[PDB]
């Protein structure tokens, strides 16, 4: 539905003929993010689905052909939906930290063959936002430092 979202919106924006006719309908991207604002209160049951979702967006539509609009933008926008979700969640659901974090790192460390640029970009924003919030989940980093010997150089430095 979300790929579909982005195809629709891309086609509209490249094209005024459709912009004259169609009323600007909210896009699935924007709706999900509004779920994510509304999530705050009492929605322990919703968040565990979000995470599943976002890592599915990034895992499926992470870059690959360098390791164009059609293979790039509704993957870029898919992936970059992913990150926005999981940053936004990591602000407010303080118990699915170490489950975002630990899964980021889990896809960081071992692969080093699939491009993971997007994931460290995520990780930078995540930590930057509140690193004080990773001193509530710290062991998961320091146990990922033990694999730093086996990693390509850009990976490690970055």
């Amino acid at each position: 539905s979300v790929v579909k979202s982005f195809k629709d919106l891309q086609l509209l924006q490249g094209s005024k003929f459709l912009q004259n006719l169609v009323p600007h309908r909210s896009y699935v991207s924007t709706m999900i993010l509004e779920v994510v604002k509304n999530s705050v209160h009492s929605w322990d049951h919703v968040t565990q689905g979000l995470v599943e979702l976002g890592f599915i967006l990034m895992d499926s539509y992470g870059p690959k052909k360098v390791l164009p609009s059609l293979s790039r933008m509704p993957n870029q926008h898919a992936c970059k939906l992913g990150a926005n979700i999981l940053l936004e969640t990591f602000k407010i659901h303080e118990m699915i930290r170490q489950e975002i974090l630990e899964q980021v790192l889990n896809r960081v460390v071992t692969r080093a063959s699939s491009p993971i640029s997007h994931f460290l970009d995520l990780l930078s924003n995540i930590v930057m936002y509140a690193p004080l919030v990773l001193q509530s989940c710290s062991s998961k980093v320091t146990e990922a430092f033990d694999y730093l010997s086996f990693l390509p150089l850009q990976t490690v430095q970055r």
Binding site: D8, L11, G14, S15, K16, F17, L18, N20, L21
Partner: protein, 550 residues
């Protein structure tokens, strides 16, 4: 090389910052000794060009090739050092010239040795070690600076034209680095803001050299006409603008405040760029540097991404572009192609282009003529950038691809309208586009295209046209029992598709097949499917659509 770059950057930092005791002077005078002895060195001190030919066959050639690249980097770092000591000493500029002459000697030797074999090593187009900070400084000093205390001593560096093209090559390589990676190589190529600040300063410099000194001052040589400094600065301009849109989209306003919203800023800059292009064009050069023209339309295309489609400057842009399309001939396929690309891209995000598509097809049908050699048509009045060698191979592909995009958009509309069952005005606009596209194809089918990708693409798009008509009549099959009757505008469309398009489709299939695998069977399959679904509709609509058919 890389060691020395670190030393002299360290040493510049030690001058500027640390002093505002008895150690740095050691390294200074070491460096000054290296300067004077590296000056009076020449090529049999390093046994170069004569005893080892730097060959990628032997180990000793490899040793001397590695040595030569080390030398070239050493030359450049000591250039930076001799510049960094003083306020514009004559003697230090003589040293810099001597070092560059050594470097340039080595480069033109290695170029002969990369002229015997291919340019498969990316090791002579490897980085300079000069800071981008430095080169920005250097180019401001070379071109714009006219302070008489520095002029006498810089006028020897100005006279080296070779030195200036080296300098702009360096700056271009930093820009190319920033595009390809996230960042450039040397020092302060990891803080983006410092890189941004040095870009802006460079941009001002290269504008000045572009704008102040024209290109029609060529008193160097006829090998230097693809190598003008006024061209190289514009190449950077293009790459800078792309690079800063790509990486630094949230600072374009403070980027233009170097040279009120982004629109007015950019409009006055465009005015200067498009005047540059106008005066380039209006010179009426028979040799015609299409290179210079291509870079002007490339930069205008890069910049035109920041005009809003509701701005008056947008409409100024569009009117200006359409004027150049209606005036200026300029016989080179890629020139026409780039301009047409920009115009269409801008146009369609303001309104549908199907009028412009129709007029271009009228020009194609004018210039080429017909299949039957008894239709005298000429509509050269419509668009000046349409020639015998341009519009037949090249413009056709673009106008048909644009038409394919139109058909994708109406397909999306038709799909969404089927799924829905705001009703009437949607289909009215759809049939307006489709009617004018149908007259467009009526003009195209009459023409004689070349036998490459063009003819099969025309047949493929006409298969897409019949597929869109099939989807149209399928939605009409869905709706015609519920409402009861067909709208009158659709009845005119199906009359025009029966009468105008389909007979001449068959005639063009016969014309392409007579002159001496899958697409022509696919077109006749598509046209018979169109007829079949039209039979279904004419039965299930209580209207006789075969009296409109022949």
């Amino acid at each position: 090389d890389y060691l020395l770059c670190c030393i002299q950057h360290c040493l510049a930092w030690y001058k500027n910052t640390v002093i505002p005791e008895a150690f740095y002077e050691d390294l200074d005078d070491i460096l000054e000794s290296i300067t004077n002895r590296m000056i009076k060195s020449e090529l049999e001190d390093f046994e170069l060009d004569k005893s080892a030919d730097f060959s990628q066959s032997t180990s000793i050639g490899i040793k001397n090739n590695i040595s030569a690249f080390l030398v070239m980097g050493v030359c450049e770092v000591l250039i930076e050092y001799n510049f960094s000591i003083s306020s514009f000493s004559k003697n230090r500029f003589e040293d810099i010239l001597s070092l560059f002459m050594c470097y340039k000697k080595l480069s033109d030797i290695l170029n002969e040795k990369a002229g015997k074999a291919k340019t498969k090593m990316a090791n002579k187009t490897s980085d300079s070690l000069l800071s981008m900070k430095f080169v920005s400084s250097l180019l401001t000093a070379l071109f714009r600076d006219s302070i008489q205390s520095h002029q006498e001593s810089l006028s020897v560096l100005r006279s080296s034209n070779e030195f200036m093209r080296y300098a702009v090559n360096v700056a271009l390589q930093k820009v190319q680095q920033l595009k390809e990676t996230g960042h450039v190589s040397g020092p302060d190529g990891q803080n983006p803001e410092k890189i941004f600040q040095n870009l802006c300063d460079l941009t001002r410099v290269l504008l000045w050299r572009y704008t102040s000194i024209p290109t029609s001052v060529e008193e160097s040589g006829k090998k230097e006409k693809g190598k003008s400094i006024s061209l190289l600065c514009l190449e950077g301009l293009q790459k800078i603008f792309s690079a800063v849109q790509q990486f630094y989209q949230p600072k374009i306003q403070q980027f233009l405040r170097a040279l009120v919203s982004v629109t007015q800023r950019t409009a006055f800059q465009i005015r200067q760029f498009q005047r540059s292009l106008l005066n380039l064009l209006s010179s009426q050069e028979e040799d015609f540097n299409s290179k210079e023209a291509l870079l002007l339309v490339t930069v205008l295309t890069s910049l035109s991404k920041l005009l809003e489609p509701s701005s008056p400057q947008f409409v100024q842009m569009l009117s200006w572009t359409s004027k150049i399309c209606k005036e200026n001939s300029r016989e080179d396929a890629l020139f026409c192609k780039s301009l047409m690309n920009l115009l269409f891209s801008l146009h369609v995000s303001y309104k549908s282009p199907v009028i412009l598509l129709r007029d271009l097809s009228q020009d194609i049908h004018g210039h080429l003529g017909d299949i039957d050699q008894d239709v005298e048509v000429e509509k050269t009045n419509h668009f000046a950038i349409v020639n015998l060698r341009t519009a037949a191979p090249t413009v056709c592909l673009l106008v048909l691809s644009q038409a394919e995009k139109v058909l994708e958009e109406v397909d999306w509309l038709i799909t969404k309208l089927k799924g829905q069952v705001p009703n009437q005005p949607v289909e009215k606009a759809i049939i307006m586009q489709l009617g004018t596209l149908l007259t467009f194809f009526h003009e195209l089918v009459q023409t004689a295209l070349p036998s490459g990708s063009c003819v099969d693409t025309l047949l493929k798009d006409l298969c897409k046209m019949y597929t869109t008509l099939t989807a149209l009549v399928r939605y009409y099959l869905q709706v015609c029992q519920s409402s009861g009757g067909i709208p009158k505008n659709m009845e005119k469309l199906v009359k025009l598709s029966g009468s105008h398009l389909t007979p001449l489709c068959y005639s063009f299939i016969s014309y392409v097949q007579n002159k001496s695998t899958k697409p022509i069977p696919n077109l006749i399959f598509a046209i018979e499917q169109y007829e079949k679904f039209l039979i279904h509709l004419s039965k299930k609509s209580k209207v006789s659509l075969m009296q409109h058919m022949k």
